[PDB]
Design a protein around this ligand. Structure first.
Ligand SMILES: *[C@@H]1O[C@H](CO)[C@@H](O)[C@H](O)[C@H]1NC(C)=O
Length: 402
């Protein structure tokens, strides 16, 4: 039997329903998503880190000419400064006053700490939603991880569960993101091969172990001081450091819909966004006839207490006269009231207690119970505290009138 019902995509809050037919007893169904995960399809564009400016030892020729011998290292600068007269701890290096030459060259390379202190620049394409759910059908219970795509089923005990596509496809990650120190940032980093100096991406590598290294650090050499041996260089300050100094708070403190953000895998969890269109294919063999189950006759309902509140502040007693003692389900076919409990136990004729949370100030709802239903009605009072530390349990509704 094919049944389908939208389930609000809230983490920690439960959801209940009853599936029934003209000659088959109510079969309860309960769902509880303990963690809804939003993994995006992601690939690595590069990794960046602090640079370090390596530099070959100056090659000094005493009154002889030199040449800018080229090598091919990242962001290389090579220059042949003439008219030098260097000094060491032992005195003047050369005897010719003029015509001495010093060839000096400098280059960029990855910091020694880049293997463990680096930022990963990624592109995030599309979303994949998977949720850890607790599903019960007529006391057949399962705890699983369902891939929310409408395709992948979870088929334990013969009932086939399919969690349709997340109704409002949405991600907190833009197309192009960055990971650093276990925090995910939305940042339009330069494409590989366009990194500009003094900003994020000044040095880049396709992988942490990649041989290639593009560097654009605005490296330019200056002539050394007379009587000193060294390689002067003025360079744009490390763009990665500047990004660290100047960056907005991570998505874990700015993401919409209250999403939590985690980094392995890159993902967002507990996004209170949209709803999951669950579809349940219940086998014909799991249904039970109305005759077998406890049948209720001549029930009455009364709200012995009502506190219009986020939690289950509403209490109602049902006086029952059952045909045979046992257990059976209880529900409200309406968004007015959401029940804490799924089923109750009955002993011939007596009373039972139902907990619920409500939106209506003047509540009235049909409590469906054990192959019957009773019209519960009453007046309800406001709650105590202005602010509470948990999310809503009761479906909001327009009617809150006198
Ligand atoms: C779901 O099942 C798991 C089983 O480990 C349990 O720990 C968790 O509390 C259950 N959640 C609810 C309230 O259904």
């Amino acid at each position: 039997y094919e049944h389908a019902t939208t389930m609000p995509s809230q983490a920690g809050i439960s959801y209940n329903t009853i599936v029934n037919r003209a000659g088959y007893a109510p079969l309860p169904i309960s769902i509880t998503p303990t963690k809804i995960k939003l993994i995006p399809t992601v690939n690595l564009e590069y990794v960046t880190c602090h640079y370090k400016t390596g530099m070959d030892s100056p090659a000094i020729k005493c009154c002889g000419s030199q040449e800018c011998t080229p090598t091919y290292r990242p962001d290389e600068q090579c220059k042949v400064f003439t008219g030098v007269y260097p000094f060491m701890w032992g005195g003047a290096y050369c005897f010719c006053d003029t015509e001495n030459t010093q060839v000096s060259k400098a280059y960029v390379m990855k910091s020694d700490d880049c293997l463990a202190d680096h930022a990963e620049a990624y592109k995030a394409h599309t979303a994949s939603v998977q949720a850890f759910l607790n599903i019960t059908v007529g006391e057949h219970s399962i705890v699983t991880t369902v891939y929310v795509n409408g395709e992948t089923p979870v088929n334990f005990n013969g009932v086939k569960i399919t969690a349709g596509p997340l109704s409002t496809a949405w991600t907190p990650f833009d197309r192009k993101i960055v990971q650093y120190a276990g925090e995910i940032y939305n940042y339009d980093f330069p494409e590989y091969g366009a990194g500009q100096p003094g900003a994020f991406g000044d040095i880049q590598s396709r992988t942490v172990s990649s041989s290639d290294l593009y560097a654009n650090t605005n490296l330019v050499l200056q002539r050394p001081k007379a009587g000193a041996i060294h390689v002067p260089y003025t360079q744009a300050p490390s763009g990665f450091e500047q990004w660290k100094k100047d960056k907005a708070p991570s998505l874990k403190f700015t993401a919409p819909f209250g999403c939590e953000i985690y980094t392995n895998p890159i993902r967002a969890e507990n996004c209170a966004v949209g709803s999951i269109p669950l579809a349940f294919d219940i086998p014909d063999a799991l249904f039970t006839r109305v005759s077998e189950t406890p049948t209720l006759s001549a029930a009455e309902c009364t709200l012995n207490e009502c506190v219009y509140s986020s939690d289950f502040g509403g209490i109602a007693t049902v006086k029952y006269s059952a045909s045979k003692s046992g257990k059976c389900a209880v529900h409200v076919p309406s968004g007015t009231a959401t029940l804490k409990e799924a089923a109750v136990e009955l002993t011939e004729q007596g009373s039972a207690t139902i907990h619920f949370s409500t939106a209506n100030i003047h509540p009235e709802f049909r409590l469906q119970i054990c192959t019957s239903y009773v019209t519960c009605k009453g007046d309800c009072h406001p709650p105590k505290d202005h602010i509470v530390t948990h999310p809503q349990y009761h479906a909001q509704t327009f009617t809150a009138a006198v």
